[PDB]
Design a binder for this molecule. Structure first.
Ligand SMILES: CNC(=O)CCC(=O)N1CCC[C@H]1C(=O)N[C@@H]1COC(=O)c2ccccc2CSC[C@H](C(=O)N(C)C)NC1=O
Ligand SMILES: [Cl-]
Ligand code: NA
Length: 285
């Protein structure tokens, strides 16, 4: 029995919540709080351990971009600090290839990173890899065919509809087909050999449209939209279905959790988080 972990987020200030949803019995677990509150972070799982990467701590008295890597063990219910990244990355994208964590883009105050770095859990070390062709904050990352895809984001001047691809063996980035929609703060994931980009911000509105990349035909195609417009949403795949958690719709911080069935091309409300929040980090273990 695997669970959907939600870490951090934002509601009036950055949050410390770590909670797990069981899609089988519909229950939520309140787990050990993050040591430092964070929003705009990303979550991932390497060998049964959950990792919270980057983000920023917004508080009513000051804000602090994070370069932290923290590790939660479900067996112990304890967060342990890991080696920090070379630079702070708020609105980060994360991907795992061969049990290695790739920290993609993000911001550090005025800087919009195009730099990418890789964590080796076995050595507790980060090393920079080839940078992206474009600076991307609010970037969606997906691992497909042992390639690391950086999808959309914001380069400090424009919200991007562009997407690029990283070849770990070759240490290089190549531009792929751009999305039909400009999206910064989308939920990006892989389901049945397809990259799905759900929600986001086109620079005007928060989106509810969902589109998928088919590698064979190198084309992005729209699928059923979500019931709620959402940017800074959390996303994961669990038992052949996509789950989208919370987000921001232009005025409200959503508690809404939606599920996509690829077989029926329908979205349905599955549960509500214990409280509305945006900019969460999500993973399944
Ligand atoms: C459109 N305005 C922007 O971008 C910058 C302005 C902004 O919204 N700000 C400035 C300091 C606080 C921050 C904020 O309020 N962030 C929170 C937390 O977001 C995140 O983790 C996050 C994570 C990934 C991608 C993008 C985001 C931000 S989503 C935008 C949403 C928002 O529009 N409002 C006004 C509450 N914000 C928030 O949900
Ligand atoms: Cl933010
Ligand atoms: Na490709």
């Amino acid at each position: 029995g695997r669970l959907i972990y939600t870490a951090g987020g934002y509601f009036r200030q950055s949050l410390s919540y770590l909670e797990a949803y069981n899609p089988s019995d519909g229950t939520w677990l309140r787990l050990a709080d993050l040591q430092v509150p964070r929003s705009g972070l990303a979550g991932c799982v390497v060998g049964g351990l959950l990792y919270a990467v980057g983000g920023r701590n917004n508080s009513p008295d000051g804000n602090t971009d994070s370069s932290a890597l923290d590790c939660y063990n479900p067996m112990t219910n304890q967060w342990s600090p890991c080696a920090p990244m070379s630079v702070p990355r708020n609105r980060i994208g994360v991907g795992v290839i061969d049990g290695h964590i790739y920290a993609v883009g993000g911001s550090h105050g005025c800087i919009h990173h195009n730099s990418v770095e890789r964590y080796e859990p076995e050595r507790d070390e980060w090393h920079l890899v080839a940078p992206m062709l474009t600076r991307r904050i609010g970037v969606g990352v997906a691992v497909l065919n042992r390639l690391l895809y950086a999808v959309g984001g914001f380069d400090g001047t424009n919200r991007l509809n562009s997407a690029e691809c990283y070849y770990p063996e070759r240490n290089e980035w190549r531009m792929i087909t751009a999305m039909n929609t400009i999206r910064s703060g989308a939920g990006v994931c892989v389901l049945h050999n397809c990259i799905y980009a759900a929600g986001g911000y086109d620079g005007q509105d928060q989106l509810n449209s969902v589109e998928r990349y088919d590698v064979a035909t190198a084309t992005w195609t729209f699928v059923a939209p979500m019931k709620h417009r959402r940017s800074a949403l959390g996303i994961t795949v669990h038992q052949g279905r996509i789950y989208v958690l919370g987000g921001y719709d232009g005025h409200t911080f959503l508690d809404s959790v939606e599920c996509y069935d690829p077989d029926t091309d329908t979205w349905s409300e599955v549960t509500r988080m214990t409280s509305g929040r945006s900019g969460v980090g999500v993973a399944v273990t």
